[PDB]
Amino acid sequence: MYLSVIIAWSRDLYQLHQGLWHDFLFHVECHVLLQSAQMSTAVATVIQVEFQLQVGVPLYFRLRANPIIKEAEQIAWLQRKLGNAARVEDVHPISERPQYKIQTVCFEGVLTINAPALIDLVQQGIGPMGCGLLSLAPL
């Protein structure tokens, strides 16, 4: 898997994914973070990892998603969609501003890990436009 990107290119979100295309998982920082299955255009300028991981290891996480308002419903949604890949250890759901409609929500917090299912969940994305990329980090 390849982590990498500066999209000028931010007309509409459409032109974002259409731009990077010239599937993969971006996620904005517009500026951008970009996860892809493969490893530079004049419309998209670019500024390789397969993690080892382990079971029962705590990892900070961030994720833009499309839960389709209530905080309880949001957190429940997150733990449901996370499946048995990892137990949520703690989370704050940031009710982001609507995009163009798409009501994105940014789950930031910390997971404990329950491993391959997690990998597949990362490389597949989560939920129904920037949404879906799960970013992970140690502590």
Binding site: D90, H92, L139
Partner: protein, 318 residues
């Protein structure tokens, strides 16, 4: 001593607590590191709107700025005990805004109100009407005795604790309340960006007893101490949406600097937080020669077995 210092070092989750306009969890930089924060007014409304407060202290204060729906409310609550005219005149004189059948009358700002106090003012307005006192002369007569109005504040304690501001009407000279409490913003004792750990929050508050007694109409030190105990509890427990330390003193004292150097621990923050609190406490008490009545409740100075023992201990001064 006159100042009672409360140090409810609580512990729980650093998420979904307090949000700003962008719906993010409130924070603050302390010791050059980010701490998760809960605002004092948040804690205050959480306390004064909770059930414990309703069971031990009494009814909360009606904080509003809309005076039309308000005159509606006092009309349909003091309808029997007073005439309509007198209730309207009382609200008008008290707020300064000319009351009418307007359905849209606003005060200068959101102020807390107490119904009993208003009733008392209505009584004095009745006496005025019968004896025909000028509103100015009446204002003089009322200025003579503030304490009574403050016992009408005994009805609404959250006001006597956290004060009230006024910039219009008779209230200006009769309704200015200096809050008895003083509550710090809740912050974590540790950097919030090794194993997972729940956040540990240092809450501080204090109570100026004399000011509380004055705000309640000249109540005894006992009553003030009781309300103080209630605040100790509410601050030690309630969470919007472990370790306690009460200590008497002559001048207010906060222990936040114990956690200036942010607490670092790879597996649990509560124990090094308590050790930090203890260290800094010793250094402060020794260095500034404080010998006020302590009472520390922890599970790891007059120690205490439970929280209720400390509660009662407070209720009995030292």
């Amino acid at each position: 001593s006159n100042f009672i210092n409360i140090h409810v070092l609580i512990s729980h989750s650093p998420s979904c607590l307090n949000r700003d306009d962008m719906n993010m969890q409130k924070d603050a930089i302390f010791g050059g590191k980010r701490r998760v924060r809960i605002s004092s007014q948040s804690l205050k409304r959480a306390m004064r709107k909770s059930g414990y407060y309703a069971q031990n202290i009494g009814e909360s204060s009606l904080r509003t700025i809309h005076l039309a729906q308000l005159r509606d409310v006092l009309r349909q609550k003091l309808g029997e005990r007073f005439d309509q005219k007198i209730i309207d005149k009382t609200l008008a004189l008290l707020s300064g805004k000319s009351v009418d059948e307007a359905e849209k009358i606003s005060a200068d700002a959101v102020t807390p109100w107490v119904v009993g106090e208003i009733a008392w003012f209505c009584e004095q307005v009745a006496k005025a009407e019968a004896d025909n006192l000028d509103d100015k002369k009446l204002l003089k007569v009322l200025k003579e005795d503030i304490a009574a109005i403050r016992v009408n504040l005994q009805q609404g304690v959250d006001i006597a604790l956290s004060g009230r501001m006024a910039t219009s009407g008779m209230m200006t000279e009769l309704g200015k309340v200096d809050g008895a409490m003083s509550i710090a913003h809740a912050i974590t004792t540790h950097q919030v960006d090794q194993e997972f750990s729940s956040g540990v929050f240092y809450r501080y508050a204090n109570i100026n007893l004399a000011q509380l007694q004055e705000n309640l109409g000249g109540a005894s030190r006992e009553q003030a101490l009781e309300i103080a105990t209630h605040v100790v509890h509410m601050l030690a427990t309630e969470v919007p949406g472990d370790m306690v330390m009460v200590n008497f003193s002559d001048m207010p004292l906060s222990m936040a600097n114990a956690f200036e150097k942010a607490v670092k621990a790879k597996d649990g923050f509560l124990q090094p937080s308590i050790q930090a609190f203890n260290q800094y406490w010793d250094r402060v008490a020794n260095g500034y020669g404080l010998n006020g009545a302590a009472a520390q409740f922890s599970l790891s100075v007059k120690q205490m077995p439970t929280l209720e023992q400390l509660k009662s201990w407070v209720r009995n001064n030292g």
